[PDB]
Structure formats: C-alpha cells, structure tokens
Design a protein around this motif. Structure first.
Motif: not given
Ligand SMILES: [Cu+2]
Ligand SMILES: [Cu+2]
Ligand SMILES: [Cu+2]
Ligand SMILES: [Cu+2]
Ligand SMILES: [Cu+2]
Ligand SMILES: [Cu+2]
Ligand SMILES: [Cu+2]
Ligand SMILES: [Cu+2]
Ligand SMILES: [Cu+2]
Ligand SMILES: [Cu+2]
Ligand SMILES: [Cu+2]
Ligand SMILES: [Cu+2]
Ligand code: NA
Lengths: 280, 275, 278
Positions: B250, C66, C118
């Motif tokens: 990420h 998430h 996001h």
């Molecule tokens: Cu993410």
C-alpha cells in the motif's frame, strides 16, 4: 535475579550534559564521565525521580523523557521554556504510577516499560542535532514482581550507527550460557530499521516474555522500529542453542553491509566460546 | 484438521541452484529449485536435518529465523557454517514446546511463521543471495493449531513479489469457504505495508483471535521490514462473497509500479463474479 | 462513561466527492461541505450502512473501506467496476458483524476497530492522486460495551503533511483536564512515520486501553506506521501530568523539523493553559 519491589521512593540524581570528542555530546551522572548512550535510569512504579540537571556546554540543551509522568515545566522543550541555558541548572521531576481501576471502571495503564530520554533543543526545536550528537539514554520502569535480569545492555540504532560508534565496531556484549540478559532497544534519527538476533527470540509485548500459555503475543526474532521507538526483552543466553558468537544486526540489507552488526558472545561456564575466531 | 504433537526426526535434501537470468533458488531435488524456496513445515518438538549441497560456483549458506540451532548451523562465514562450491553440509534445526522453566517463567515455544535465506552471497549479510532468490518459508505448528486447506507464500523482496516482474502477480485461487493460510515475508532494502481487500486477520501469533479475551488489534494492513515474517488464516470470501480480491503493497509508488496481485475466490461452480 | 450499545441498525447516508481549492478533493455528507479529512463515520458491530454516493467531479472516483464487510460490487476499484463515473451515483453498502464461534470451534473476529476509507481510482488504479488530493476519512466500528469518549479527533499523516495542511499549521486540539479524548491516527502516501504524544501514553491493542491486569500489550507513546495503517486510542487529557500545551509530532527528525507538529491544548477548569502564549 529476583523480582522488582513495589515503588514509592523519592530518588535524586545529578545529571550533566558535556561535549565529547568528535563533535559529540553526552549525558553523565558525574562531571567528566558522560557516555553515549547516557546512564541507565531504573525506577519502580510509584517512584519519583528528581534530576538536578547541569548544562556544562556552551549551547542550550534539554532533557525530555518518554513514557513517564511529568508536568509541563519538565517537558524539556523550548516551547514550554523547560530547556537549560549554557552553564545553567534545572531540576527535572519525573513521576511514575501503578496501574489501577478508575472511577469510570476503566483500567489505567501503569508507567512500567522500556523508555528513554533525549535532548529536545540542540540544533532544532526537535533536538535533531542533540540526538545525532549522542544526547540519549535508557529508562526502565518496572512493575512489582517483574523478573529482574542478571545483566542489562542498551542498543541504540542512531541513524546509521549503533551507539554512535564507528561502523564495524560492535558493541559486543558477553554472557555465560544460562544468564538472564535484558536488552533495551531504542531507535533515533531519520531511518527505519529492523532489529535481528541470531539464535534467540522474544515475545512482542511489554516485558518480552509470554505471561503464560494464554498470551497470544507473536514470538519474533526480527522487529521493525522507527525514530524514538523503544522496546525491551529478556532472554536466557544460549537457551536451547548453546555457546558461541551470536550475531545481532540491523536486517535492512544495506545497513547490515554498512556495519550495523555486533556480537552477543555467549561463553560456556568454563569461559570458552567454541568456534570463535575474531579475525573472521 | 489440527496439528499433532511433534517429536519426529526428519531428513530432507536441499540444493542451491542457479536459475535463469542471474537468479538463485533452493530446491528439495536437483533441478526442482524455486523462488520462493520450498515450504518447510514442522510441529513443535520436531528435529530437521537438512543435508545441503551447493551446486553453484560461489559459496552459499542456509540460515533460519526463529528455530533452535547450534552455532555450527548458523549459516554465516563468520562462524564457518557456509558451504563451498560443490560442497555439502548438514544443517540441523530443532524446535521445542512452550513450558514453565525452573525459575518459574514461561519459555516461548518455537511455533510461528518463519523463514530461511542465504547469508553469504555477495556480502556477509547475504545481500546478493536474497536479491537473487535464496529465501523460503518455514512454519512451525503448535499442538492443536488449526490446519488450513492451502498455504500461499507472499514475499515482498525489494520492489518485487517473489522476484517476479512488475504487474505479474502472483494470483492465487480459492473457493468460497476455503481456509487459506498466508505466509508473508519481507526482504531487502525497503519497508512495505501489506494490504488485503475483503479480508482481515488478528495481529498475533496465528492471525486468529484466541477468543473474546484476546485484545489484539484486527487489521487489514501491516507495516513490515526486511526479514519480518508473519502469517494468518482467513476463510476465503467469508461475509463478503466470491470475487477477485486485490492484495498489494500500500506504499503508493510500490502499488503503482506493480506490487499487486489477486486473491481469486470462486463460487463452488468455479466462476468468479466480475472477472 | 458512555458505553456502546449493540448494533444491528440499517443506516443510510449521502456522501459526495467534490473539488476543493488548490487542486484538492474531499468527501462530505452535504454538498458544499466536503472536508479533509472526510466526515467521521461511527458504527456499532452489526450495523449496515448504505452510502448513497454522488461524484460531483469531472473524474471517476471511488469509495474503498478497510476492515468492514462488503461485496465485490462495493470494493471501490476499477477492476471490479465499482468506481463512480463523473456526475454518476452509486450505492455502496458496508456491513459489520459481531464476533462469535464458528461451527468448527474457531473464533470469528468482529468488525470493531479503527478503520478508514479513501479513493482507489483517481490518478492510478491505487488512487495515488485521489489520496494525495485529500480523498480519505475515518471509520470507527465499536463493539457492545466499548467506552465512549467526550471527543474524537482525527490526525492523518499524508505524505509530508498533517491532514493536507501547510507545514507547521497544526492542527491544534483543545480539551479540559480530565476529558476522555479519542484519537484516530491514519497514515497515507509514500513515507513511513512515527507518531508521538508528549505527556500521554496508550496501549498497543484494539482499543488503545488495557483490558485489565492480564493484558500484556505494550504501553507506548511512540508508534511506527506506514501507508494505510490505522489505529486509535483514548486518553484522559492531562491525567497525572496537568494542563499545558502538549506537543504531538512525527518523530522522524526531518519530518518534525519540516512541520509535522501540532498541539494538544489541555486547559485548566478555568479555561487557561499554563505557560501557553496564544
Ligand atoms: Cu486502502
Ligand atoms: Cu516525547
Ligand atoms: Cu538499520
Ligand atoms: Cu537470523
Ligand atoms: Cu543475520
Ligand atoms: Cu522523543
Ligand atoms: Cu512496498
Ligand atoms: Cu483495502
Ligand atoms: Cu536473516
Ligand atoms: Cu487497495
Ligand atoms: Cu513523519
Ligand atoms: Cu518531542
Ligand atoms: Na499485541
């Protein structure tokens, strides 16, 4: 070798910041005996420590501690006016406290753990130059009944150095098979690191030892750490693996190649270290 | 399936081989080397003798994390436990159970997600060997640990997954309901964050919470650095269904530059919705 | 204090992506009120949230979350065709679940925790431009019985900024000594950071507070984090240390020197801060 007592004592120490050779600066307990890392401070939960602090240098310096209880006037920042002018004196007061149940029924965490102190004022208002020059040291706060070790050693990854020493110069530590050895591991500077020890492992929790068979903490021999992280653990030197020159190093490959390596020399009870040839 | 108690003495042959295009790999039979190296699985208390042969023209070694070994199986040049070209050497790895020591403290067992890699190719830290592909996974199970239906190894090695070119995966398949085990190893120079879509695990030894008293954080993102290793088990598609579920580093430039793959979770008929 | 109830409500909220000044982009619950970070979403385990989403921008955007349960059609990625076209709308559905025993005896972890959402699509298929522009925000899922705070503040390390603000501009947060304050700490972008608070500490576990004396979680005041990490904790403002301007900052030295610094202003009951020069 025993267990930490209950705290509550009021303790007093004198600390000095002095310049050392090479543009370096260190803390010490007596004039002319400053070191990098600074002196180890050990407290039991409940203790109060007054640091009578003298700055012998020609630039301002401060003392800032992680983890412990302190009022804003012992912050150690330029912002709260708790730095020390050149040649000046200041009394810093660090407090610690026991865990316990609050009135709202929540559990208040105690002070116990592996912490550290450092400058917050030299070079920049973040202490970047003071830290780089060596103004750092370990603080251990123990909880009642914590296992006490036979020896404690402090390892600081400061940017590309260990304990501000030149590359490829350890430091080395010695133990005998079966000693209970405590490592305090502190990181400072710009870089992330990973700390690895050959032939030994520890639990990723407050003390570095599992509390019992219900502790789900991961058992590791490699730990990523960043600037101002601190952790510690206890190992039984040579347990299940025996005597020898056990390497510790940063495991970031280029840091290992630069010389972020050292030896944990574990001796047999007769003083011998099998296979150890220091020209290798 | 549950892991049994250990105590067995096991033997394997391992080879270090040159592979195509500068790469090096470990294998259990000649010509069968892979990157990552072969998965070695042990139950606490087992002993493993690795009869090792270096078929390359440079020295190589085998060094393991987490497991018990004497100084003579360190796998370092410093302690003369490397292997000369064409040479052979028996490395011995032992494991142990948890238990109370005589001083009353708790001795941690060997159980965990670990790895082995080279320590002498290029430099005495093994920088060139690890870059070239000499790393592989090791799992040590505790008696009673839940056993998975499959295990996949994901290695972030510098800017690659498993030394593969950018944007080439790997992808793994499962069926909705499969108990899938992931071993996650990091090597090289860079920090990473490992991230999964649609799934999460607990940040503890096994990746599953022990019960309602386990305070471990439940996560779908974990920072990791060179030589970090962890693992977990997930039920593929649990509560979220079938589909192509991304995993990737990420750190934004790493994902953009190709550190990305798919966890392909199929319906029982074999189809993957949206893919 | 307050405690979280059991969940199981089905909620509906409208969310917009809008352009802001200076090339930035934000989420909001009402047109014209986008912010960076985006609005805080708080759920109890078992709750279902339907996000009726509208893209007011000229570029495709998405919403990726998430930790929560979602089907592939709410994944928020181009490869699953769950982005939202310019001017388009889409219903994203997030579910949560309680912990419990599976029929095989293993324990299924609950949804509770500190999470975030996001973009995944603006600029690159990893949302690099969208995240850099400001398209991110906090999600808190609570478990039945979790202690509730008096105030929640969100701090996001996004590349070299805090909350996309100019260097050295805080943000600063205010509390009174004794307030139960909750911090949500999210990291994004390219760099690792370490987060440090002066005068305060927390437990490195799900809630940020020890469950009791059997909890062996490390107690810390400094934590390394990397892109897309989230954690959170609650502290009692000033507990054992008093009122004052308490610094929080990234502890990577160049980052604090360049302005990843802010103030947690803990006031005396009479509203003053000892030693603080407004
Ligand atoms: Cu993410
Ligand atoms: Cu501090
Ligand atoms: Cu390093
Ligand atoms: Cu090692
Ligand atoms: Cu090593
Ligand atoms: Cu500090
Ligand atoms: Cu990466
Ligand atoms: Cu995700
Ligand atoms: Cu290693
Ligand atoms: Cu993603
Ligand atoms: Cu930073
Ligand atoms: Cu500070
Ligand atoms: Na933990």
């Amino acid at each position: 070798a025993g267990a930490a007592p209950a705290g509550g004592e009021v303790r007093r120490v004198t600390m000095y910041a002095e310049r050392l050779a090479g543009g370096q600066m260190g803390y010490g307990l007596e004039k002319g005996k400053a070191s990098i890392p600074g002196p180890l401070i050990e407290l039991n939960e409940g203790d109060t420590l007054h640091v009578e602090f003298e700055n012998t240098m020609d630039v301002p310096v401060s003392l800032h501690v992680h983890g412990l209880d302190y009022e804003i006037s012992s912050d150690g920042t330029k912002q709260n006016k708790s730095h020390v002018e050149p040649g000046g004196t200041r009394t810093y007061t660090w407090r610690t406290h026991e865990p316990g149940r609050r009135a709202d029924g929540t559990w208040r965490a105690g002070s116990a753990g592996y912490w550290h102190y450092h400058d917050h004022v030299v070079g920049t208002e973040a202490g970047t130059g003071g830290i780089r020059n060596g103004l750092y040291g370990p603080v251990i706060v123990r909880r009642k009944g914590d296992v006490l070790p036979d020896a404690t050693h402090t390892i600081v990854f400061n940017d590309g150095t260990i304990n501000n020493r030149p590359a490829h110069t350890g430091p080395n530590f010695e133990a005998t098979v079966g000693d209970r050895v405590e490592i305090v591991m502190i990181t400072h500077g710009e870089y992330y690191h990973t700390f690895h020890m050959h032939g030994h492992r520890w639990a990723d929790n407050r003390t570095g030892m599992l509390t019992g068979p219900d502790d789900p903490s991961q058992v590791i021999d490699n730990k990523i750490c960043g600037p101002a992280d601190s952790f510690g653990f206890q190992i039984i030197a040579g347990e299940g693996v025996g005597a020898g020159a056990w390497m510790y190093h940063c495991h970031v490959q280029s840091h290992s190649d630069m010389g972020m390596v050292g030896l944990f020399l574990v001796k047999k009870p007769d003083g011998t270290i099998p296979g150890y040839d220091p020209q290798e």
